[PDB]
Design a binder for this molecule. Structure first.
Ligand SMILES: Cc1cc2nc3c(=O)[nH]c(=O)nc-3n(C[C@H](O)[C@H](O)[C@H](O)COP(=O)(O)OP(=O)(O)OC[C@H]3O[C@@H](n4cnc5c(N)ncnc54)[C@H](O)[C@@H]3O)c2cc1C
Ligand SMILES: Cc1cc2nc3c(=O)[nH]c(=O)nc-3n(C[C@H](O)[C@H](O)[C@H](O)COP(=O)(O)OP(=O)(O)OC[C@H]3O[C@@H](n4cnc5c(N)ncnc54)[C@H](O)[C@@H]3O)c2cc1C
Ligand SMILES: Cc1cc2nc3c(=O)[nH]c(=O)nc-3n(C[C@H](O)[C@H](O)[C@H](O)COP(=O)(O)OP(=O)(O)OC[C@H]3O[C@@H](n4cnc5c(N)ncnc54)[C@H](O)[C@@H]3O)c2cc1C
Ligand SMILES: COc1cnc(OC)n2nc(NS(=O)(=O)c3c(OCC(F)F)cccc3C(F)(F)F)nc12
Ligand SMILES: COc1cnc(OC)n2nc(NS(=O)(=O)c3c(OCC(F)F)cccc3C(F)(F)F)nc12
Ligand SMILES: C/C(NCc1cnc(C)nc1N)=C(/S)CCOP(=O)([O-])OP(=O)([O-])O
Ligand SMILES: C/C(NCc1cnc(C)nc1N)=C(/S)CCOP(=O)([O-])OP(=O)([O-])O
Ligand SMILES: [K+]
Ligand SMILES: [K+]
Ligand SMILES: [Mg+2]
Ligand SMILES: [Mg+2]
Lengths: 601, 601, 219
């Protein structure tokens, strides 16, 4: 009688495909991104005309992958991908690697050739379990239909726990076509569903360290976004102990940048005020951030004041991190607090002393913010639109709609300028490829985010070269009914690469100018509204038309070429050893570039 | 003095990037396909404005990969790819897997993060050596500049010997930026530069078997194309011993299909005459073909007459194969002849008896060819153009120019119809993704083939869904000056998948209808000539304008929807258990489809 | 434990970090994880019927039995029942030794590199080979292209061949092509096989050869 209670017969008679369908329902999947093919056909037949979730069809499986990423980052739910064997599966490798580097919960289901054909170099056979091993948290090949529910449960659990990340489940055609003939453990048919004394002591110790600090700073990242209460507790800590807050690129929106305590973004292209502050802080509170090499600058020269404080027992680095692999990986933590940062903050904050004022510290911070704004060369009569100005215009106008605003980007200068010049205020509103840094990410990510948030304004701030990578997915946006807003910053160059070529290779631009299509005729061919802004006098009204649109829309803006992103901490330099914008220096750079290229650039 | 003669000092003082450049020259590389990025910048600076080879810039690294494949298959030279780390490298995974499955010599050079940053989850770091291990013959990461020339030599050698295939060489940024300070063995600075008694005896034994055969057949594949004399010796053998010849998809063009001895293509969608002949042959001469599962049909039921003949010592299977892994992998060879098929044919043919006539065998063969043409439902008044007719029109008109004609394809029905209805006569004129079967292959492969053969007519016969995958590379064709000819068979469906859904899933079309852009406005946006054929009366003049064009051109043809590719040997059936076209059956299928879909399809 | 003991049995390894085994369980776990464990496909059933019809035609059958028959207590019993019913000589591998009573007149002893020349001669001349839980290892088959000529001829003429009872798909058609492959536990499949096999009283010609070979090929 007990055995009957622990076994389940309800799936008997169903195909593997039909069992897949049922398990999607039980895992509350409301959206699937995918593309059909021979090996995955039994699953596609099972989900035929399903009213249980929305299916989104891209033009390319890489599109499906990045869409699912955008969906996951906007919603906080795992992004589900369904593709066929061989090239269908190998086409998702870049999105999987992308999701691993940025901690994105992705569940990839790939069709596979029949088990009778595996290992024979069969039609459309790829060793995707072998290939994807390094770009997934975990993967598996299902070998019989009886274990399919269990493997699906395991995939979703692994993808969404610890540091979230991609998993892949390989589905042989004869398994998904086969019918379950036996009962299975009832726990495998259902999804899911205290603090260690060691961590509790670490938290108490961390509190005592912070209570001594005279120059504290919070360094917050993507981890704080993986709980709804995250930003709330971050604000509570900063308010109680009176601490300035800087964030990573992936942490943007975790803290209200309108708050006086906001130091904006830190790192290679972050605020020099933020970079100066972290180099001078005696206590660094790292909340869900991994000390990436775009953030720390030269590692041996990173955070000198905090390391000194640690040695003198009056400060140091307090690292709230969920993955042991990323604790003491780059920098030694004075105290490591393992687990979910939000949960641990609940225990941390009541032990932290309330502080009214920090006159000396905040005097320095206010002085640094004043002398280190995001300065750049403004428009002049007759000049092209400056890309920094464009971003500001979009940020100002977008904030006046009574809708949430979500931003995705491509990779390059436009991405950095978007990060710098938007005013970030809400969690999960910056959706950008940071770790892997995949060009082409912007458009499909926007589609995925728009599907997750149908009532949001979703803006893809894209580069012309990045947009070229995946522009076929415009048709996908129309077919999905996703009214995304794409803004292409057209500088007719791979700007981020030409910046480095100008700086380190004496203006030798080696293969960094790709030809662009006519973006207005392209938009027309894709059945998308097109807007082109070519001069300063069209900027305001053009951006308004862009944002007022109630349909998918592509905005092209002609912007100044050969303009560097500043500030910049060059590779190998300390975080406070930065290059700042200077008008006279820019003019000299222009003359030098003109001379060296014979007036071509 | 001897040591001075064996060491070389000539590269001392050069950066790794400059050494790469020199080694490309020494390997007679005339074309490089690639895309820049941070990790590979030292190499791009070294090849800046090089007049030693043509550089081709795609819009996407997958484009570079498939272009290099098309280049390699058209030219017989290795296709060289140059990309950056991370997403640049992961984007080449599908082309590498593609090249492995189809035996294409591909040399991929990928930038990598500095050695000081490897294994730290660095900016744009992917474990590409781990990821690409299953989709390359061999890969390596260069760890110091002194070993760079040797690794480049090894890569080219491995890629082009045995069964050709892809290799990857990983290039850390600090290695390519570093300068060679020491002498290296002089053999590493230069590229390169008898039959075993066992094989010789096998050849003699194989000859004696063929000299007994009463119903011989040649089964020829891609391997015969890997030597310039290949097709010549194939013809010499067939003529001398009077043997009918069938080829694989990848073998198309190895034998002049106008020859009476031609049995056309065999396999799942091959001629029923070819399939019948191989099932009844007492001796099968396999020349550079791997008995793939799209060719053999049900393996246990494959070649019954040849297996009987082997057991009775009067025939069997004679396998000329260069890779031991593919000998006795699928079917047992009666005699295995290891090595280059063309070289071994030179030893084989003089031992083979000359034969004047085979009255009985060729009477059967001629009868089979007569009753098994590639039949289909012809146009009727007012109907759309039939896709089979379109292919015939292009084949007939293309053959009247005084230029070589090279065909690339996408993947699906159009691919099979192209294979069936073109008349193949010349080697290396069918460039198609067969093993992996990658949609999106057609356009970039055409660009690569066109660059390899600037005086050739290059036609991409593409599907609408396949073309959507990589249509951004149209801009790439213009920028490269490659006057490719793209013909999109627009049936507004994933036809190959709907064929299987009609056949096995009762006309349940699950997510197999993607929306298409306006292909004429698309062509215009890409600065490409556009032609649209919508009815029967525009077919001839439209195809002529297509072929007469001296610029990149996109032709869209509206063709009949929901038409199956026939003949068809269903998966699991014997090669001679095929479905044939029948007019009445097609009509009944149409009525059934109409009823089941409520008149929607 | 499940993986080690199912399919073809084999080794598994479980790695146990010191701090895991020293740590204390503080949370409830699914009750199924706290307990160990605890029909024939139509495809296999048809293969079995087909295999029976092939054996019922055979004039020179031989059983080639290996370690697989030992992985069920009823294994040797069913092997003997089959051999007795259809009157078939039995040879075994090194790992199959003890599966068949070698005192039985139908015993051909061990085959292979150092096996009986009587067993080796018999398998090279048999028109039907019944492989029971054996993997055609290279110490057993001799030269693969020259292995079992009479059984391959019989298969081509539709009057015999190789009938392979094997639990692991990886070892089916790995070395030699099976005329019929019967997937699953050999003992369980024999229960379905034997009632379809015709009872045979004598094989005068075949057993005359076998007895002659045993006489001239002692150890
Ligand atoms: C062109 C370019 C320029 C760039 N320049 C910059 C720059 O100037 N500044 C900058 O900041 N970035 C920059 N980057 C991005 C950079 O590379 C990284 O992607 C980014 O800094 C990572 O931020 P993160 O640590 O907050 O997020 P992640 O990489 O996702 O790390 C989050 C950390 O928090 C942990 N974590 C996750 N969930 C939890 C939880 N629930 N509880 C506790 N811990 C958790 C994770 O395990 C991980 O260790 C740039 C990228 C590009 C493409
Ligand atoms: C939708 C679709 C349908 C298809 N249907 C068919 C079909 O009906 N018919 C068909 O034929 N194909 C079909 N295919 C293609 C099929 O999958 C294989 O790609 C193709 O049959 C392989 O042909 P091949 O053996 O000649 O080439 P390869 O796969 O390249 O094999 C060549 C063999 O020759 C060997 N070799 C290479 N060089 C030499 C040398 N110098 N000397 C000796 N040996 C050498 C190689 O090692 C290899 O074993 C289809 C593909 C698709 C996408
Ligand atoms: C010096 C030396 C000399 C040797 N010479 C010989 C020789 O002359 N003759 C000889 O026979 N061996 C010889 N061997 C041993 C030989 O190498 C192999 O180990 C042996 O032949 C394997 O026998 P086997 O196939 O029965 O067992 P296994 O290797 O264990 O194969 C058993 C097969 O049955 C399958 N199976 C397992 N369980 C089941 C089940 N429940 N139902 C169905 N199928 C199942 C397995 O998957 C496997 O395919 C020699 C070894 C040495 C060291
Ligand atoms: C050209 O072959 C196919 C074309 N289009 C297809 O669906 C749209 N399929 N679907 C299959 N399935 S298959 O034939 O059993 C098969 C396959 O068949 C093995 C044998 F049963 F023929 C081997 C490897 C892969 C596949 C795959 F992935 F395609 F399913 N083959 C094709
Ligand atoms: C945002 O960082 C870059 C943007 N654009 C670039 O070139 C177009 N590069 N180039 C680099 N080189 S890097 O800084 O030494 C570096 C890197 O730096 C390590 C340390 F020296 F900072 C770590 C991992 C990869 C790279 C890579 F691949 F980008 F070279 N970084 C960027
Ligand atoms: C080539 C390159 N980076 C290397 C590279 C190569 N390939 C891929 C898939 N991704 C990346 N990041 C950049 S950042 C160029 C970006 O050009 P852009 O899209 O027009 O943006 P912008 O000009 O504003 O810098
Ligand atoms: C989806 C699919 N195959 C599965 C698939 C999925 N994804 C990739 C990258 N490649 C393949 N082969 C086909 S063949 C559809 C082909 O549609 P088509 O390009 O319009 O050609 P056609 O309609 O003539 O069959
Ligand atoms: K800001
Ligand atoms: K033809
Ligand atoms: Mg740009
Ligand atoms: Mg189509």
């Amino acid at each position: 009688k007990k055995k009957e209670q622990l076994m389940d017969d309800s799936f008997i008679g169903l195909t593997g495909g039909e069992i897949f369908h049922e398990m999607m329902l039980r895992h509350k999947v409301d959206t699937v991104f995918g593309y059909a093919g021979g090996a995955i056909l039994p699953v596609f037949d099972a989900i035929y005309n399903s009213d249980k979730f929305k299916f989104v069809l891209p033009r390319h499986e890489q599109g499906a992958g990045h869409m699912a990423e955008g969906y996951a980052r906007a919603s906080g739910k795992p992004g589900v991908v369904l593709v066929t064997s061989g090239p269908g599966a190998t086409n998702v490798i870049t999105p999987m690697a992308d999701a691993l580097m940025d901690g994105v919960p992705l569940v990839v289901f790939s069709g596979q050739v029949p088990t009778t054909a595996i290992g024979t170099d069969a039609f459309q056979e790829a060793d995707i379990v072998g290939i994807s091993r390094s770009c997934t948290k975990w993967n598996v090949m299902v070998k019989n239909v009886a274990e399919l529910p269990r493997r699906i449960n395991e995939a979703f659990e692994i993808a969404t726990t610890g540091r979230p990340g991609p998993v892949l489940v390989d589905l042989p055609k004869d398994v998904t076509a086969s019918i379950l003939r036996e009962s299975i453990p009832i726990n495998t048919t259902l999804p899911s569903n205290a603090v260690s004394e060691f961590t509790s002591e670490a938290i108490k110790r961390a509190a005592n360290i912070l209570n001594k600090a005279k120059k504290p700073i919070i360094y917050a990242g993507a981890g704080i976004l993986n709980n709804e209460q995250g930003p709330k507790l971050l604000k509570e800590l900063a308010d109680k102990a009176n601490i300035p807050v800087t964030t990573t690129l992936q942490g943007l929106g975790a803290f209200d940048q309108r708050d006086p305590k906001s130091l904006d973004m830190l790192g290679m292209h972050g605020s020099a005020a933020a970079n100066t502050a972290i180099q001078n802080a005696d206590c660094i509170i790292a909340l869900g951030a991994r000390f990436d090499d775009r953030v720390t600058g030269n590692i041996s020269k990173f955070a000198p004041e905090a390391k000194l404080a640690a040695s003198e027992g009056r400060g140091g680095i307090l690292h709230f991190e969920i993955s042991p692999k990323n604790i003491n990986k780059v920098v030694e933590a004075t105290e490591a607090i393992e687990g979910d940062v939000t949960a641990n903050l609940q225990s941390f904050i009541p032990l932290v002393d309330s502080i009214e004022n920090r006159p000396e510290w905040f005097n320095k911070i206010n002085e640094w913010k004043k002398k280190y704004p995001y300065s750049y060369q403004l428009e002049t009569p007759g000049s092209l639109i400056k890309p920094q100005t464009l971003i500001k215009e979009i940020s100002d106008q977008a904030q006046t709609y009574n809708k949430e605003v979500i931003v995705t980007t491509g990779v390059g200068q436009h991405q950095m300028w978007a990060a710098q010049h938007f005013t970030w205020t809400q969690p999960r509103t910056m959706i950008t490829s940071g770790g892997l840094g995949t060009m082409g990410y912007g458009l499909p990510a926007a589609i995925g985010a728009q599907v997750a948030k149908p009532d949001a304004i979703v803006i893809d701030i894209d580069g012309d070269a990045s947009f070229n990578m995946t522009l076929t997915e415009l048709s996908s946006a129309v077919q999905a009914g996703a009214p995304i807003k794409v803004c292409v910053l057209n500088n007719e160059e791979q700007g981020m690469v030409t910046q480095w070529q100008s700086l380190f290779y004496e203006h030798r631009y080696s293969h960094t100018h790709q030809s662009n299509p006519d973006f207005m005729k392209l938009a027309e061919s894709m059945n998308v509204k097109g807007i082109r802004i070519t001069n300063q006098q069209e900027l305001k009204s053009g951006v308004k038309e862009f944002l007022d649109a109630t349909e998918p829309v592509l905005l092209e803006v002609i912007v100044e070429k050969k303009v560097p992103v500043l500030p910049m901490v060059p590779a190998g330099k300390a975080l406070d050893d930065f290059i700042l914008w200077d008008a006279e220096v820019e003019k000299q750079q222009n003359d030098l570039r003109k001379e060296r290229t014979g007036g071509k650039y």
